[PDB]
C-alpha cells in the first residue's frame, strides 16, 4: 500500500481483502475503498488507535463484527458508501462517540434497528439516500440531538408521520427528493426549527403541505415535480424569510391572490400553466423580486405600481395570458427583458415604454397591435432584439431603433411600405412580411427570412435585355398579327365556315394573350430599375389579378378552341353544324373564363409571382388548381393527338387538305410550346430535379405567349384562305 508523510495512508484500489498489515502504529486517515473487502473481523482496527478518517466505500462489504470498530474513540469521519450492508449496523457503530459524518447511502439498506445511532452525540451529517427504506426512522433519528444535515432522499418513502423530526432541533438541511412521498401530516415538521433547506422535489404530493408553517426560518423550498394544483392564500405565512421556491413542472390551476405576499427576501417567482387565476398577484412587500414569470391565464390588467415597487426587477414574462392595456413602464431601470406574446394589445402609446434604460430584448408578437406611436421607442437606447411579428400592423416607427440587431415583422401582411435601411444600420437578422421590403437591405451581412430570389425581383421584372427585347417583339407581333387576322376574317360579314370562325376565335384568344404580355412589358418599362416599391403594390392590387386572369383565360380558351377545331376537322373528314359549333365554342369560352376566375375565388393564387402566373409555382404549395389544370391540358393534348392519328389512319379536297395541314401544324406547335411549361410546373412535385429559378422564369416568359405570337404568322403566311380573304377585304374597302 502507498503511504504518505502526513499520516494519511491511501490503500484504495490495491485489491486487498482485509485491513492492511505492517502499517504505522498511529495514523489519522485511511483510504481502503476500492479493495474488495467482504467482511471486517473482530478488532480489525485494534492496530490503529488514533484513526480519525475511515473510508470503506466502494468495496462490497457485507459484514462488520460488533467489536471491529471498538477502540476508535477518535474517529471523525466514517464513509460506508458503496457496500452491501443490507441493514444499518447498530452494534458496530455503537460506542463511536466522536464521529461527525456518517455515510450509508449506496448500500441496499432495507431496515433500521431501533437501537441504531446510540451512544454517538457529535454526529452532524447523515447519509441514507439511494436505499430502500419504506418508512422514515423515528427513534434512531430521535437519538441524534446534534444532527445538522440529513438525506433520506432516494428511498421508498411513502408518508411522513407527525413528529418524525422532533428531536432534530439543530437541523438545517433536509433532503427528501426522489421518493414516493404522498402524505405529510400537519405536525410532521413540528420542532424542526432553524431548518433552512427543505427538498421535496420529485415526490407525489397532491395537496399543498401546511406543515411548512411550522418552520420559522426557511430559505429554500423545493416542491418541484408533484401533483400540487392549488396554492392557498397564506401558504408561506410561517416562512417570512424564504428566498427560493421551486415549483416548476407541476399541474397548477389556482395560485391565490396573496400567496406570494410579504415575502421580502424572495428573488424569483415563476408560475406556468395556472390558467384559472384571474387577478394579478398581490406582491406588496415583495420588493426584492428580480424576475416574475406568469402563466397563460385570464389576467387582463397590470398594476400601475408595478415599477414603483420591484426596483430590482430584471425580467418580466407575462406572455400567454390575455393582457390588453400596458401601463407606463417609467422606472424599472434594471429591467432588461419584457415578454408579451399572444396577449391582446391594441396599440402602443407614446409613454408605455418611456425610460426603460438597459432594456435589451422586447417581444410583442402574436398581439393585435394596429397602432404604434411614432416616438414609442425613441427613449429606448440599448434595445437590441425586437419581435412584433403577426401583430396586424400598418406602419412602423424608425426613431430609437438604430441599435437593433434583430427585427421580426413576419405576420404584418397589412404593412406594405418599404423600411429604409438608413435608420437600421446595425441589423443582422431581419424578418419582413414581403420579400420586396427585404432587398432594400441587400445582404455587415443582413439575413432576411423572405428570400428575394429571382421570382420576387426588385431591380428588373423581366431580367436581362435579351429577354426584355424578346418579350417586346413577341407582344408587338402577337398584337398586330392577331388584330390583322381578326379584321380580315370577320370583316367579310358573310357566311362564315366553321374552320374560318375557329381560326378567328383562336386569333382573338392569342390577341388577349398579347394584351397580357403587353401589360407585363409596360409594367417592366415603367418600373425599370425600381421594382422594389412596385412589387408589393402590383401583387396585392387588382392589376396582378386581372393580368393573371387574362393569361389563364387566353391559354385555356386557345387550348379548348384548338380541340374543337380538331373535332370539327375529324367530322368534316367523316362527311351543316354551324350553330352547334358556335354553341360549343361559346361553351369553351365560358369554361376558359371560369377556369381563369377560379384563382380569384381561391386564396392568393396570383400573388406568388409578379408575373401573376399561377401554374408556375413553388416547391411548397403544389396547388390542386395548378395540378388539375396541367393534367387537364395534358389529357386534352393526348385526346386530340390520338383522334388526329386516327384521322390519318382512316385517311390514307384540296381546301380540306390545306385546312387539316394547318390544324396539324397548330397542334404540333402548341404541344411543343406547352411541354416545357408543364414540365417546369410539375418539377416542384419531385425533389430529385433542381432547376434554377432564373432559367425557370425566363423559359416561362419566352414560351408561354409563344404560341399566341406564332399562330397568326402561320395563318397569314402559309394559308391561301388568308390570301383570298385579303383580296375580298381589298375589294370591300375599294
Amino acid at each position: 500500500c502507498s503511504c504518505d508523510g502526513d499520516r494519511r495512508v491511501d490503500c484504495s484500489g490495491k485489491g486487498l481483502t482485509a485491513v492492511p498489515e505492517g502499517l504505522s502504529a498511529f495514523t489519522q486517515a485511511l483510504d481502503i475503498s476500492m479493495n474488495n473487502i467482504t467482511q471486517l473481523p473482530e478488532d480489525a482496527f485494534k492496530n490503529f488507535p488514533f484513526l480519525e478518517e475511515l473510508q470503506l466505500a466502494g468495496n462490497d462489504l457485507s459484514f462488520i463484527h460488533p467489536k471491529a470498530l471498538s477502540g476508535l474513540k477518535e474517529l471523525k469521519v466514517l464513509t460506508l458508501q458503496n457496500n452491501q450492508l443490507k441493514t444499518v449496523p447498530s452494534e458496530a457503530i455503537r460506542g463511536l462517540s466522536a464521529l461527525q459524518s456518517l455515510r450509508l447511502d449506496a448500500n441496499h439498506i432495507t431496515s433500521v434497528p431501533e437501537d441504531s445511532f446510540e451512544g454517538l452525540v457529535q454526529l452532524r451529517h447523515l447519509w441514507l439516500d439511494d436505499n430502500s427504506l419504506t418508512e422514515v426512522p423515528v427513534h434512531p433519528l430521535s437519538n441524534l440531538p446534534t444532527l445538522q444535515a440529513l438525506t433520506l432522499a432516494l428511498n421508498k418513502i411513502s408518508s411522513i408521520p407527525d413528529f418524525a423530526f422532533t428531536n432534530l432541533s439543530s437541523l438545517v438541511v433536509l433532503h427528501l427528493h426522489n421518493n414516493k412521498i404522498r402524505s405529510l401530516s400537519q405536525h410532521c415538521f413540528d420542532g424542526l426549527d432553524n431548518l433552512e433547506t427543505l427538498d421535496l422535489n420529485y415526490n407525489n404530493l397532491g395537496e399543498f403541505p401546511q406543515a411548512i408553517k411550522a418552520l420559522p426560518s426557511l430559505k429554500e423550498l423545493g416542491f418541484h415535480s408533484n401533483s400540487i394544483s392549488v396554492i392557498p392564500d397564506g401558504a408561506f405565512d410561517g416562512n417570512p424569510l424564504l428566498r427560493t421556491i421551486h415549483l416548476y413542472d407541476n399541474p397548477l390551476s389556482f395560485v391565490g391572490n396573496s400567496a406570494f405576499h410579504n415575502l421580502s427576501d424572495l428573488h424569483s417567482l415563476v408560475i406556468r400553466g395556472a390558467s384559472m387565476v384571474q387577478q394579478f398577484p398581490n406582491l406588496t412587500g415583495t420588493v426584492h423580486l428580480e424576475s416574475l414569470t406568469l402563466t397563460g391565464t385570464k389576467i387582463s390588467s397590470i398594476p400601475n405600481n408595478l415599477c414603483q415597487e420591484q426596483k430590482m426587477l430584471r425580467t418580466l414574462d407575462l406572455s400567454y395570458n390575455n393582457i390588453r392595456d400596458l401601463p407606463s413602464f417609467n422606472g424599472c431601470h434594471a429591467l432588461e427583458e419584457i415578454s408579451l406574446q399572444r396577449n391582446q394589445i391594441y396599440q402602443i402609446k407614446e409613454g408605455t415604454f418611456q425610460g426603460l434604460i438597459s432594456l435589451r430584448i422586447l417581444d410583442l408578437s402574436r398581439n393585435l397591435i394596429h397602432e404604434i406611436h411614432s416616438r414609442a421607442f425613441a427613449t429606448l437606447g440599448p434595445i437590441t432584439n425586437l419581435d412584433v411579428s403577426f401583430n396586424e400592423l400598418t406602419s412602423f416607427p424608425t426613431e430609437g431603433l438604430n441599435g437593433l440587431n434583430q427585427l421580426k415583422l413576419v405576420g404584418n401582411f397589412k404593412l406594405k411600405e418599404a423600411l429604409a435601411a438608413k435608420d437600421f444600420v446595425n441589423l443582422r437578422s431581419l424578418s419582413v412580411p414581403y420579400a420586396y421590403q427585404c432587398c432594400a437591405f441587400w445582404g455587415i451581412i443582413i439575413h432576411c427570412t423572405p428570400s428575394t430570389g429571382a421570382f420576387k425581383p426588385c431591380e428588373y421584372l423581366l431580367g436581362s435585355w435579351m429577354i426584355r427585347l424578346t418579350v417586346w417583339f413577341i407582344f408587338l407581333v402577337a398584337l398586330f398579327f392577331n388584330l390583322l387576322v381578326i379584321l380580315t376574317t370577320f370583316a367579310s360579314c358573310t357566311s362564315l365556315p366553321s374552320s374560318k370562325l375557329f381560326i378567328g376565335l383562336i386569333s382573338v384568344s392569342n390577341l388577349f394573350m398579347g394584351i397580357y404580355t403587353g401589360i407585363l412589358t409596360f409594367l417592366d418599362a415603367v418600373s425599370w430599375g425600381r421594382f422594389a416599391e412596385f412589387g408589393i403594390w402590383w401583387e396585392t392590387g387588382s392589376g396582378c389579378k386581372v393580368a393573371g386572369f387574362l393569361a389563364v383565360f387566353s391559354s385555356e380558351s386557345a387550348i379548348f378552341l384548338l380541340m374543337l377545331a380538331t373535332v370539327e376537322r375529324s367530322l368534316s373528314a367523316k362527311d351543316n353544324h354551324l350553330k352547334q359549333f358556335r354553341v360549343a365554342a361559346l361553351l369553351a369560352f365560358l369554361g376558359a373564363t371560369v377556369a381563369g376566375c377560379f384563382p380569384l375565388f381561391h386564396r392568393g393564387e396570383y400573388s406568388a409571382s409578379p408575373l401573376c402566373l399561377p401554374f408556375p409555382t413553388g416547391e411548397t404549395p403544389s396547388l390542386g388548381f395548378t395540378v388539375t389544370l396541367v393534367l387537364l391540358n395534358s389529357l386534352a393534348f393526348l385526346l386530340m393527338a390520338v383522334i388526329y392519328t386516327k384521322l390519318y389512319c382512316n385517311l390514307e379536297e384540296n381546301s380540306q387538305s390545306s385546312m387539316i395541314k394547318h390544324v396539324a401544324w397548330l397542334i404540333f406547335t402548341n404541344c411543343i410550346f406547352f411541354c416545357p411549361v408543364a414540365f417546369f410546373s410539375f418539377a416542384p412535385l419531385i425533389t430529385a430535379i433542381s432547376i434554377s429559378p432564373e432559367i425557370m422564369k425566363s423559359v416561362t416568359l419566352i414560351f408561354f405567349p409563344l404560341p399566341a405570337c406564332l399562330n397568326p404568322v402561320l395563318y397569314v403566311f402559309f394559308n391561301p384562305k388568308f390570301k383570298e380573304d385579303w383580296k375580298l377585304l381589298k375589294r370591300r374597302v375599294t
Partner: nanobody
Amino acid sequence: QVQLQESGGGSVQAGGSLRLSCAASGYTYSRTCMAWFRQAPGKEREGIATINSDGTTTYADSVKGRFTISRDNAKNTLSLQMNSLKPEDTAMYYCAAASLSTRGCSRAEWEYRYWGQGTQVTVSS
C-alpha cells in the same frame, strides 16, 4: 453546509488554457447544481457554466463551446477547463452550489446558496 474551496488559475497569456478546481469540504452533497460565476472588474457576477446531478451541462453564450465544466463526485470536486483565453476573460471566478433541481441550472446568482472565495484569472494580451 459546504465550504466549497476553489484553487487553480493565474496570469496566463492570450490563447492559453487554464484549469480551475473547486473541492467541497463540508456536507458535500453529490446531487445538486454546481456552477461557475465570473466577476468582471466593475461589472456584476454572471454564470458561465452549470452542471446537473446527472451531468447535463449548460454554458453561457460568450463561452459556449470554449469552456468545459465537469463534476467528479467520487472525489467531491468540480472542474472548469478553459481553452483559447481571450483578454476579455480576465476576472474573478467563483464556484457555487445550490439545492437539487435536475432542470438546466439557472445562471442567476440568487439560485445558489453556497459560494467560494473566488480565484483571479488574468489574461494579458
